[PDB]
């Protein structure tokens, strides 16, 4: 029921609001394969990423209409919901471009 619209290599991180530092998403340092999935039936999108090594799901979050997606640098992009701040430290500029293109697309069609 969902179609992948991109795959990008990134170290997924969340911001620890109490210690003022980034920490690895899911508790595990290393790179993940991060998709945006489009549920075509209802036109919704989510980010799902899984560690390359062991397949652990480290991010699974909805992309809401109006999201402010911040391209802080050419290889680190970030966004937030009401509870967490998410960061993607991409493995290359090409990966950042792939993901940002798909995200900017999702945000235009929502």
């Amino acid at each position: 029921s969902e179609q992948s619209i991109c795959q990008a290599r990134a170290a997924v991180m969340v911001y620890d609001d109490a210690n003022k530092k980034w920490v690895p998403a899911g508790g595990s340092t290393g790179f993940s394969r991060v998709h945006i999935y489009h549920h075509t039936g209802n036109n919704t999108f989510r980010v799902v990423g899984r560690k390359i090594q062991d397949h652990q799901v480290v991010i699974n979050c909805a992309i809401p209409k109006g999201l402010k997606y911040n391209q802080a640098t050419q290889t680190f992009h970030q966004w937030r919901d009401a509870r967490q701040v998410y960061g993607l430290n991409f493995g290359s500029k090409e990966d950042a471009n792939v993901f940002a293109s798909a995200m900017m697309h999702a945000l235009e069609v929502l």
Binding site: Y15, K20, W22, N70, A72, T73, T75, F76, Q78, R80, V85, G87
Partner: peptide, 4 residues
Amino acid sequence: XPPX
């Protein structure tokens, strides 16, 4: 947004 926090810096990197």
